[PDB]
Design a protein around this ligand. Structure first.
Ligand SMILES: OC[C@H]1O[C@@]2(CO[C@]3(CO)O[C@H](CO)[C@@H](O)[C@@H]3O2)[C@@H](O)[C@@H]1O
Ligand SMILES: OC[C@H]1O[C@@]2(CO[C@]3(CO)O[C@H](CO)[C@@H](O)[C@@H]3O2)[C@@H](O)[C@@H]1O
Ligand SMILES: OC[C@H]1O[C@@]2(CO[C@]3(CO)O[C@H](CO)[C@@H](O)[C@@H]3O2)[C@@H](O)[C@@H]1O
Lengths: 442, 442, 442
C-alpha cells in the first residue's frame, strides 16, 4: 500500500504458512511496481517494511531482495536448543513443553546448495550496478534450518551441522546494511555477506549453525558487536577475509565452532573485549598476512567438551596450534586473559605442552601484558547438557599445568614480547626478538 | 490469531485498572490456541503483546510460563522520582510533570511477603520440566514501583529503596532471554534472573531501584551490555553468582549502589570497559572464590555524595576495603583507571591510608598497568541535585593524596603486580609475590 | 486515543509536503489530551509518533516540549549522497536510485541564522523550568539535509559540508534521552545535545554530515556506543564539552572529520574500544584541562584521502600535531594501536618527523603499552570512492617510516611513559618524566 507497510499474514492470495518466500517475493514485486520513479520531488524509492508476526512460516521459494531500504522484521528471535532436543531420546519427546523454535519463524524448506551455497539461502540479497544496494535491515525474527542431515561419518544426522541451508546471503557489494536482534538456528550457514561496507551485525543470537557469521570477498568499516554466537566443529563463528577497519567487540562466543574469530588477509581491524569459549585449539586465527590488528582485552577459555554426544568430536587441530595464532605483521596483542583447562592425558600430540599464543610468520608483532592461567582437570562427560556445561565452567579443582605462553616460530622475527609469560613460558630466539619476561615470585 | 496483541484492544479486563489481569488473560488465550507441539513442524511459536504509551496499574502478578513470549512497549519513560519526592510537596503543582511515563506498568502489589520476594514481582517467569523456558523478550517499556516506604531506616520514606516490589523475576532455568531498552524506576528489585543461560541485558535504563540487575543461583554464557545503571546504598548495581563466561561491558554505572559490580563464585568471566562511579568503597567485589576473571580497561571514580538528602548515607564500608576487592585465584586486573576523590578528614577509619586494589585471599592474580590517581577535596553538600552532581564531577582543583594502590593481604600469595604503583604504594610481601614498581621519575 | 499516531493517518496537512506541521499538530493534540499531572498516579505518559517508510519534506521546525515522546520509523535509509553528487549530473537518470530512503525526513528549512543554529534544526527539543525534560526517544528513521551549498571555499557546492541544517538540536537540560538506530545524512550538524544527563546515543548511522555528534554546555553519566560515524573536515565526529563520566566505546569512526573524538574540559570519562580512521592529524584531542580520562584499546589508523574530490582537502593541521593530543592532568592512555600510513613526500612541515602521541600540557598522565607502527606508502587517488577506500585500507606494500611515538612538550611534566616506543621514538625530558623505553633488539 501507499505507506509502504506490509504484513505477511495480511497479503492477498498469499499463505505464509505454506510458502512465506512467495509471499515476500510478491510484496517485493508490488513495491517495485509502485516505486518506479527515482527523482520525483527529491525522492521516490524510499523502500518499505515487511512485518512477520510471531508464527510458524514455511519458506519454499528463495526470497530475492534487490531494493535498497527494505526492512524485514518480526517480534521474536525465537531460539530453543534443537541440538539438545534431538539428543534427548525420542520416547521422551511427548513430555516436552515444546520441541521447535518459535517467534517470527521462517522454516527454510529448500533443497541443499551444491555444485554454490547461494541457492540454499532463505533470503538472497543481490543487485549489481550503481549505486551499491544500501541500508537493507533484518530485525528481530527467527530463521530455522529445521534438521541437520547425514554426511558419511558415524554421527547422528542431527549432529552433523550439514544441511546445505543459509539464513541470509548477500552476494553483491553493499553499504550500511543491518542485521539486528535475529535468531538463527540449525542452518549450515547462518549469515554470509560478501563485499560489505559499513555493515553492522549487532545483538543477534546465532547458534547451532555450522557457520555463524562470514564476511567474504572483501570489505571495510564494519562491525560485529554484542552477538551471542555458537557454531560447529567444521565451521566459523566469526570469519572475515580481506576486511579493513572491522570492529569485533562485545560478543559472547561459545562452542563449538572450529574457531571463534578467523581472519584471512584482514588488516587494520580490532578484535577486542570479547568473551571467547572453545573446546578446541585455534580459537583466534590471524592468517594469510593478517596485519596491523589489535587483539585486546578478550577473555579466552579453552577446555574439553563435557557433553557426551560431541565428546571426541573436534576441529582436527592439535594443542601446538595455539589459542591465538598469528601469521602476519605489525599486530598488537594486549591485555588478554587466557585460561587453558585441559586433561594432561587428552593433550595431542602425546606428551606435548600446549601453546597459547603462537607467531608462525610475519614481523613486528607486539605482544604485551597477557595473563596465561593453566590447569589440569580430568574430562568428564554426561548426557545432561546444560548441567554438564555449567558444572565444567564452574569447576576449579586442579593441579597446575605447564604451558608455552608464547611460541615464536623461526619464520617470524623482530617481534616484541612483554609480560606475557615467565622466561620459561616464552619460547623465542632472543637475538632477533625483544623479550621481557614476566617477573617471577623469587 | 496472528499472535499479536494490544492490551488496549482486549475484551476482558481493563489495562488502566489491572494490566496484569489483561496480560494473564492473553497468555491463557495463547495457551488455548497453541495446544499442540508438533503440527507441520511447529505449533507453539509464541506471541507478542504490545503496550501503547499510557499509565497502566498492575494489581495481579503476571505469570509467564510459555517460551517465545515478547512484551514490548513504545517508551522507557524514566524521570527522577527521587528528585521529585525530595522537592517540597508545596512546589509539585509547579512541575511540568510528576511521574514516569512511556509504556508504564505501575506496580500496585503488596510487599514481597514471608513466603518469597517472587510474589512482589510484576512479571514472574516460571515453568518447570523440560525444555528450559526460552527466548522470552522484554523490550522498550517502563516498570515503576511508584513509592519507596518506611522500612525502619529513619530516612524519609521516599529515600529508603524499600518496597518489596520486583520488576521482572525469572525463577526457572532459562535460555536465550532478552531484556532490552527497558526503563525500571522505584523498585526495590528491578531485574532478578535465576539460572540464566545465554541471557542478554542490553541497553536498558535501570535507575533509582534498590537493586538493579541480579543474576542468581548460577548461569553461563550471558551478557550485560550497554546499560545505564543506578542502584541504592544497601543493594546491588550488577550482581552475579556462580556464573561462568559472563561478559559485563560498555555499561555506565552511576551511584548509589553498595557496589558497582558484585561477584560471588563467578569464574572465567569478564568485567571490562565499563564506566563506574560510586560514592562508597567496595565498587567492584570478586568474593567467594571468584576466579579467572578479566577486570580490564574500566574507569573507576569513587568520590563523596554531593546531594544533601543522601550526604550522610553510606554502604557501611571503610576506605581500607578497596575500590576493587578480590578473594579468589588467577584473575587478571589490567589497564584500569582509578580516580579516588575524597576529603582526607572524612576518611574512615580516622587517619587511614585509603586502599584501591585489595587482594584479600587467593593466589596467581595478575595486576598490571593500572593507573591510580588520588585527590583531597572539600566535601560539599547541596539540595540542587544535578547541579551539584555535575559540579563535583568537573572539579579537579585539589591536592595530591597518599594511597595504597595495591594491598596484598598475607592470606593472598603468589600474585604478580606490575606497573600499578610505586614500592610505597604497593604493600605486599615481596618474598612470595612478584612486584615490579611503576618506574620512578629519572 | 491510546497515544499512538501514524503521520500518514493524520487528518490535517500533508506529511509528503510538510511533516513538521503534521508532527507539531500531533504534539498539540497530545498536550490537549494530557492536561493533568496527578490523576491516578499518572497523567502525562507521552506518546509515540510513527513514520512509515516514505519521503517526507519538512518545512516547519518541529518543537518537542513534553517528556516521554517517541518518534520512530522503519528505516535508517542511508545511501551515499556524497558519491552520487560526484557522479556527473547527466548520468543520474540511469542509477537505480539517487536519494536516501527508509523513513525519510527531508529538512527543507532555510539555512540557520548567524546568532543560532537551533533555528535550522528539523527537531528542536526545548522546555525550561522543572523537572528537566526526560526520556524523549528517536529511533530507526532517516534525517536528510538534501544538499550542501557554496560557501566561498571554491570546492564544488555538494562537497562543502555546509547548509546551516541540523537533524536534532536539544537546547535544554535533559535526562535519559535516547537516540537509536537512526540514519543522518547531508546535514551541517547531525545531532547537537546541550546539557545531557544519562544520554544514550546508540547504534546510529551518522555519516556525511559537517559535524555528527556534539555534546554541548555540560553533561554527565552519558554514553555514545556502537555508532558508525563519518563527518566533514571542518567539523567534529564526536565532540563533548564539560562532561564528566562520558563513556565512548565500540564506535567505528571513519573519515573525514577534523577529528574523531574531541574533548574540551571533559573529565573522568572513557574513550575506549573504538576503531578510529582519519585522513588528517589530530584524531583524538583532549583540550582545555581534559583530566582523569581513560583512552584505552582503541585502534587508530591515520592515512591519506584516496578519493579524488577530497584528495587535496585537509583539516589545517600538520604532522607534528599528533594523532592523540593531550592538554590536561592525570589521564590514562593504555593499550592503543596506532597505524601511521603516509607518504614521506606529503609530510608537513617538509622533512618533519610525524608525532603520534603529544602531551602539550598538564601533569601525571600515564601512557603505557601502546604499539606504534609506521609505514611509507603512496596511497594514490581514484575517482571511484569505495574502490579507492578498500585498496588503501588493505595495502601494506611499504618501506619503514621514522616517527615520534611520544612527544612530551616542556609545558607538561611528571608523566609516566612505558612500553610506548623506543628511546629514539620518545622525545621527552628523562629528568622530569618516568620513561621506560620499549625493549628493542637492535
Ligand atoms: O551457552 C550455551 C548455549 O549454547 C547452547 C547449549 O548447547 C549447545 C548444544 O549444541 O552446545 C554448544 C555450547 O557448548 C552450543 O553451540 C549449543 O547451544 C544453547 O542452548 C545455549 O544458549
Ligand atoms: O547520573 C544521573 C542519573 O542519576 C539520577 C540523579 O539522581 C540520583 C538520585 O535521585 O542520584 C544517583 C546518582 O548520584 C542516581 O541513582 C539517581 O538518579 C538520574 O536522574 C540520572 O539519570
Ligand atoms: O565506508 C564508510 C562510509 O563511507 C561513505 C563513503 O565514503 C565517504 C564519501 O564522502 O567518504 C568518507 C569515508 O572515507 C565517508 O564519510 C563517506 O561515506 C559511506 O558510503 C560508507 O558507509
Amino acid at each position: 500500500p501507499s505507506n509502504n507497510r506490509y504484513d505477511v499474514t495480511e497479503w492477498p492470495a498469499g499463505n505464509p504458512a505454506k510458502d512465506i518466500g512467495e509471499v515476500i517475493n510478491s510484496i517485493i514485486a508490488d513495491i517495485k511496481a509502485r516505486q518506479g520513479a527515482a527523482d520525483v520531488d527529491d525522492g521516490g524509492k524510499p523502500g518499505a517494511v515487511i512485518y512477520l508476526p510471531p508464527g510458524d512460516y514455511h519458506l519454499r521459494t528463495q526470497v530475492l531482495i534487490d531494493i535498497s531500504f527494505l526492512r524485514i522484521e518480526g517480534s521474536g528471535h525465537g531460539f530453543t536448543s534443537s541440538s539438545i532436543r534431538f539428543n534427548v531420546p525420542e520416547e521422551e519427546w511427548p513430555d516436552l513443553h515444546e520441541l521447535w523454535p518459535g517467534g517470527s519463524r521462517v522454516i527454510v524448506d529448500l533443497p541443499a546448495g551444491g555444485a554454490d551455497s547461494a541457492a540454499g539461502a532463505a533470503f538472497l540479497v543481490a543487485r549489481e550496478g550503481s549505486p551499491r544496494i544500501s541500508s537493507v535491515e533484518f530485525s528481530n525474527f527467527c530463521i530455522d534450518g529445521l534438521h541437520f542431515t547425514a554426511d558419511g561419518s558415524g554421527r547422528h544426522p542431527e549432529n552433523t551441522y550439514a544441511n546445505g541451508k543459509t539464513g541470509i546471503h548477500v552476494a553483491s557489494a553493499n553499504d550500511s546494511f543491518r542485521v539486528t536482534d535475529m535468531g538463527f538456528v540449525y542452518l549450515e550457514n547462518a549469515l554470509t555477506i560478501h563485499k560489505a561496507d559499513a555493515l553492522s551485525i549487532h545483538h543477534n543470537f546465532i547458534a547451532e549453525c555450522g557457520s555463524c557469521i562470514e564476511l567474504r570477498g572483501w570489505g571495510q568499516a564494519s562491525k560485529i558487536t554484542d552477538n551471542l554466537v555458537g557454531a560447529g566443529p567444521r565451521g566459523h563463528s566469526i570469519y572475515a577475509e580481506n576486511h579493513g577497519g572491522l570492529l569485533v567487540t562485545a560478543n559472547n562466543v561459545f562452542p563449538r565452532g572450529a574457531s571463534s574469530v578467523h581472519f584471512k588477509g584482514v588488516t587494520r581491524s580490532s578484535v577486542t573485549n570479547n568473551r571467547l569459549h572453545a573446546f578446541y585449539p585455534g580459537m583466534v586465527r590471524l592468517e594469510e598476512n593478517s596485519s596491523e590488528n589489535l587483539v585486546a582485552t578478550n577473555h579466552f577459555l579453552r577446555d574439553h567438551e563435557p557433553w557426551t554426544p560431541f565428546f571426541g568430536v573436534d576441529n582436527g587441530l592439535d594443542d601446538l596450534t595455539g589459542l591465538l595464532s598469528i601469521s602476519g605483521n605489525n599486530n598488537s596483542v594486549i591485555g588478554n586473559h587466557f585460561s587453558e583447562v585441559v586433561d594432561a592425558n587428552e593433550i595431542r600430540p602425546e606428551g606435548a605442552t600446549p601453546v597459547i599464543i603462537r607467531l608462525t610468520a610475519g614481523t613486528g608483532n607486539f605482544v604485551s601484558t597477557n595473563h596465561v592461567v593453566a590447569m589440569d582437570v580430568d574430562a568428564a562427560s554426561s548426557d545432561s547438557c546444560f548441567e554438564a556445561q555449567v558444572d565444567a565452567l564452574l569447576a576449579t579443582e586442579a593441579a597446575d599445568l605447564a604451558v608455552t605462553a608464547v611460541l615464536v616460530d623461526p619464520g617470524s622475527a623482530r617481534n616484541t614480547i612483554l609480560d606475557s609469560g615467565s622466561d620459561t613460558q616464552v619460547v623465542a630466539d632472543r637475538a632477533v626478538n625483544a623479550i621481557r619476561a614476566t617477573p617471577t615470585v623469587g
